[PDB]
Amino acid sequence: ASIFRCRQCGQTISRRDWLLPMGGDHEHVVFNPAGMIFRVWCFSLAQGLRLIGAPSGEFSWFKGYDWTIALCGQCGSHLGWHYEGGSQPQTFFGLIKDRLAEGPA
Numbered sequence: 252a253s254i255f256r257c258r259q260c261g262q263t264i265s266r267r268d269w270l271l272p273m274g275g276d277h278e279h280v281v282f283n284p285a286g287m288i289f290r291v292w293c294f295s296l297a298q299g300l301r302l303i304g305a306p307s308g309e310f311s312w313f314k315g316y317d318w319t320i321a322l323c324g325q326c327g328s329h330l331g332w333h334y335e336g337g338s339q340p341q342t343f344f345g346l347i348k349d350r351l352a353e354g355p356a
């Protein structure tokens with residue numbers, strides 16, 4: 252239970268070692284304006300994503316951060332967001348827990 256992959260295709264995405272307790276918890280449950288609930292796990296680092304467009308602060312769930320949609324770079328599945336423009340840390344990833352599969356390195 253050491254690396255996280257895209258559930259839909261297997262792409263390598265992150266690692267348990269890279270979980271980041273933001274505001275004291277690595278897990279944050281949030282909703283967008285369309286009412287969709289997301290169980291977000293914060294990671295300091297991720298790979299294999301494709302970050303879409305330019306950042307936006309609108310509706311940001313993390314104070315001081317602007318976001319970009321993060322797709323699986325391989326299959327296009329929406330895996331979460333990349334956050335930037337903030338402080339301590341400047342950047343991080345918020346990934347949707349149930350869209351990842353955990354398993355051995």
Ligand SMILES: [Zn+2]
Nearest residue numbers: 257260323326
């Ligand atoms: Zn994928």
